[PDB]
Amino acid sequence: KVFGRCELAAAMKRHGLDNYRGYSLGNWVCAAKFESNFNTQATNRNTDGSTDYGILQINSRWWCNDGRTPGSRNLCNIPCSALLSSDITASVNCAKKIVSDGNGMNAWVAWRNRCKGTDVQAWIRGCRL
Ligand SMILES: [Cl-]
Ligand SMILES: [Cl-]
Ligand code: NA
DSSP: OBOOHHHHHHHHHHTTOTTBTTBOHHHHHHHHHHHHTTBTTOEEEOTTSOEEETTTTEETTTSOBOSOSTTOOOTTOSBGGGGGSSSTHHHHHHHHHHHTTTTGGGGSHHHHHHTTTSOGGGGTTTOOO
């Protein structure tokens, strides 16, 4: 599923991401935009052989099991394919664990390079939330 901007904001808001660990909704929409272009089916392979999955590009090195990342962890206790669903619940619940682990949203390279310190509120402007 390829989300609309406001559609995804409302979905994320419903799942408790607005101001989660102090990160306003615009941060999450901005990260999703640049990680996946709002596409729940996005996958990308990393150089160490791990793979990033879904709308927030969550990494099989630590967070999910794809059966092909030897020596990795599965800290969200889910198959990585569950992160590709049109229902964002699994991605959001795993993202809550990631952002709580000490490093905040800096775990998302695109958020660090393209959203952090920008006016992220513009990503939810005009949306009915
Ligand atoms: Cl915001
Ligand atoms: Cl933080
Ligand atoms: Na893994």
